[PDB]
Design a protein around this motif. Structure first.
Motif, PDB file in Angstrom:
ATOM      1  N   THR A  91      40.211  56.250  51.328  1.00  0.00           N
ATOM      2  CA  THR A  91      39.582  56.520  52.612  1.00  0.00           C
ATOM      3  C   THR A  91      38.076  56.629  52.428  1.00  0.00           C
ATOM      4  N   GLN A  92      37.394  57.126  53.451  1.00  0.00           N
ATOM      5  CA  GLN A  92      35.956  57.311  53.366  1.00  0.00           C
ATOM      6  C   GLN A  92      35.595  58.378  52.337  1.00  0.00           C
ATOM      7  N   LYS A  93      36.487  59.348  52.143  1.00  0.00           N
ATOM      8  CA  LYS A  93      36.226  60.470  51.241  1.00  0.00           C
ATOM      9  C   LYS A  93      36.979  60.362  49.918  1.00  0.00           C
ATOM     10  N   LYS A  94      38.000  59.513  49.879  1.00  0.00           N
ATOM     11  CA  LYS A  94      38.856  59.426  48.702  1.00  0.00           C
ATOM     12  C   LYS A  94      38.893  58.025  48.109  1.00  0.00           C
ATOM     13  N   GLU A  95      38.969  57.966  46.787  1.00  0.00           N
ATOM     14  CA  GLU A  95      39.056  56.701  46.084  1.00  0.00           C
ATOM     15  C   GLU A  95      40.488  56.208  46.160  1.00  0.00           C
ATOM     16  N   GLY A  96      40.669  54.905  46.341  1.00  0.00           N
ATOM     17  CA  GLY A  96      41.989  54.310  46.264  1.00  0.00           C
ATOM     18  C   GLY A  96      42.454  54.282  44.820  1.00  0.00           C
ATOM     19  N   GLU A  97      43.738  54.534  44.605  1.00  0.00           N
ATOM     20  CA  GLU A  97      44.284  54.633  43.260  1.00  0.00           C
ATOM     21  C   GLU A  97      45.071  53.396  42.871  1.00  0.00           C
ATOM     22  N   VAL A  98      44.928  52.335  43.655  1.00  0.00           N
ATOM     23  CA  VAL A  98      45.588  51.074  43.352  1.00  0.00           C
ATOM     24  C   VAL A  98      44.582  49.935  43.388  1.00  0.00           C
ATOM     25  N   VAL A  99      44.646  49.086  42.379  1.00  0.00           N
ATOM     26  CA  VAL A  99      43.768  47.942  42.282  1.00  0.00           C
ATOM     27  C   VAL A  99      44.462  46.761  42.922  1.00  0.00           C
ATOM     28  N   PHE A 100      43.783  46.120  43.865  1.00  0.00           N
ATOM     29  CA  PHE A 100      44.312  44.914  44.458  1.00  0.00           C
ATOM     30  C   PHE A 100      43.657  43.728  43.793  1.00  0.00           C
ATOM     31  N   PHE A 101      44.348  43.182  42.791  1.00  0.00           N
ATOM     32  CA  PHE A 101      43.844  42.049  42.026  1.00  0.00           C
ATOM     33  C   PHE A 101      43.761  40.813  42.874  1.00  0.00           C
ATOM     34  N   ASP A 102      42.922  39.892  42.430  1.00  0.00           N
ATOM     35  CA  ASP A 102      42.859  38.592  43.042  1.00  0.00           C
ATOM     36  C   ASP A 102      44.153  37.827  42.771  1.00  0.00           C
ATOM     37  N   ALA A 103      44.582  37.069  43.772  1.00  0.00           N
ATOM     38  CA  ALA A 103      45.740  36.202  43.632  1.00  0.00           C
ATOM     39  C   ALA A 103      45.258  34.854  43.161  1.00  0.00           C
ATOM     40  N   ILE A 104      45.811  34.376  42.051  1.00  0.00           N
ATOM     41  CA  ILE A 104      45.220  33.247  41.344  1.00  0.00           C
ATOM     42  C   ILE A 104      46.216  32.094  41.105  1.00  0.00           C
ATOM     43  N   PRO A 105      45.762  30.844  41.285  1.00  0.00           N
ATOM     44  CA  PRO A 105      46.577  29.661  41.047  1.00  0.00           C
ATOM     45  C   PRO A 105      47.090  29.638  39.612  1.00  0.00           C
ATOM     46  N   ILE A 106      48.378  29.374  39.443  1.00  0.00           N
ATOM     47  CA  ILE A 106      48.980  29.246  38.123  1.00  0.00           C
ATOM     48  C   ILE A 106      48.961  27.775  37.722  1.00  0.00           C
ATOM     49  N   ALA A 107      47.917  27.404  36.992  1.00  0.00           N
ATOM     50  CA  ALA A 107      47.609  26.014  36.726  1.00  0.00           C
ATOM     51  C   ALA A 107      48.796  25.257  36.128  1.00  0.00           C
ATOM     52  N   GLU A 108      49.413  25.814  35.086  1.00  0.00           N
ATOM     53  CA  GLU A 108      50.507  25.130  34.394  1.00  0.00           C
ATOM     54  C   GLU A 108      51.702  24.825  35.290  1.00  0.00           C
ATOM     55  N   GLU A 109      51.925  25.643  36.313  1.00  0.00           N
ATOM     56  CA  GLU A 109      53.096  25.441  37.158  1.00  0.00           C
ATOM     57  C   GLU A 109      52.806  24.581  38.369  1.00  0.00           C
ATOM     58  N   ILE A 110      51.683  23.890  38.343  1.00  0.00           N
ATOM     59  CA  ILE A 110      51.359  22.973  39.408  1.00  0.00           C
ATOM     60  C   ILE A 110      51.859  21.607  38.988  1.00  0.00           C
ATOM     61  N   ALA A 111      52.910  21.153  39.666  1.00  0.00           N
ATOM     62  CA  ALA A 111      53.628  19.939  39.294  1.00  0.00           C
ATOM     63  C   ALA A 111      52.737  18.707  39.352  1.00  0.00           C
TER      64      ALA A 111
END
Length: 237
Positions: free
Chosen positions: A126-146
């Motif tokens: 919130t405005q006063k509290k730090e979030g305790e979860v990291v929202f990572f970037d969602a990233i293309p999985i190169a090897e699994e791209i047919a």
């Protein structure tokens, strides 16, 4: 080291086409995108956080009682600008729940309302509290791209407004319009694989977060033009 964080991950494919704005790419971002991922951009974790935030304000609007759009705006402003605990004190589980509401309550088991607000305060901050979860970037999985994905380039402009508005509206609403800044958008085809993850010390809190992210990527979508059905992602194998 590794962050000592618990990292909950899954593999997601684009169920419908994904429309992504190209920002000011750093050299790193350009390097990965051109050389590893066939031009496919990533989905910013801040966008994953936003849509997941949005989901929860939408559901929690059902937990207080005027017009729906006003309630949603209240819950949203409370979590993002004020004290959610104070403003949503009198929230009660609704008589009739939306599907999204049902799904939401399944994640948070037998926990009561003022308790869930606390877990959500911890997840997002919130405005006063730090979030305790990291929202990572969602990233293309190169090897699994047919096969090499066919990408479309289009130019669109941004229009900003309150998501929640009275009556039916079209967009932009009368008197309002897009801003005069042209933006490149790449459209990503279906069945492109992304890695999606969240992290935190509290494993069970982080897991709940992941479940919300799942929910939000399937039913709300990320990227642009999501209201037309673009940008839905679903877990696979």
């Amino acid at each position: 080291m590794l962050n000592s964080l618990h990292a909950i991950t899954g593999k997601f494919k684009t169920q419908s086409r994904l429309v992504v704005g190209l920002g000011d790419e750093s050299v790193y971002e350009t390097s990965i995108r051109l050389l590893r991922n066939y031009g496919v951009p990533y989905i910013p974790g801040s966008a994953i956080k936003g849509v997941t935030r949005h989901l929860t304000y939408y559901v929690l609007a059902e937990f207080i009682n005027n017009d729906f759009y006003k309630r949603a705006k209240t819950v949203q402003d409370a979590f993002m600008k004020g004290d959610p605990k104070e403003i949503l004190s009198n929230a009660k589980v609704p008589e009739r729940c939306s599907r999204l509401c049902k799904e939401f309550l399944r994640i948070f088991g037998e926990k009561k309302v003022p308790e869930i607000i606390d877990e959500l305060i911890r997840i997002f901050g919130t405005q006063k509290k730090e979030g305790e979860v990291v929202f990572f970037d969602a990233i293309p999985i190169a090897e699994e791209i047919a096969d090499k994905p066919i990408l479309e380039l289009d130019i669109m402009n941004p229009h900003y407004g309150p998501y929640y508005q009275s009556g039916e509206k079209n967009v932009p609403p009368p008197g309002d319009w897009y801003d005069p800044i042209p933006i490149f958008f790449l459209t990503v085809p279906k069945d492109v694989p992304f890695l999606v993850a969240v992290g935190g010390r509290d494993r069970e809190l982080t897991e709940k977060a992941f479940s919300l992210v799942k929910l939000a990527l399937r039913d709300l979508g990320v990227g642009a033009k999501t209201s037309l059905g673009y940008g839905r992602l679903v877990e696979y194998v």
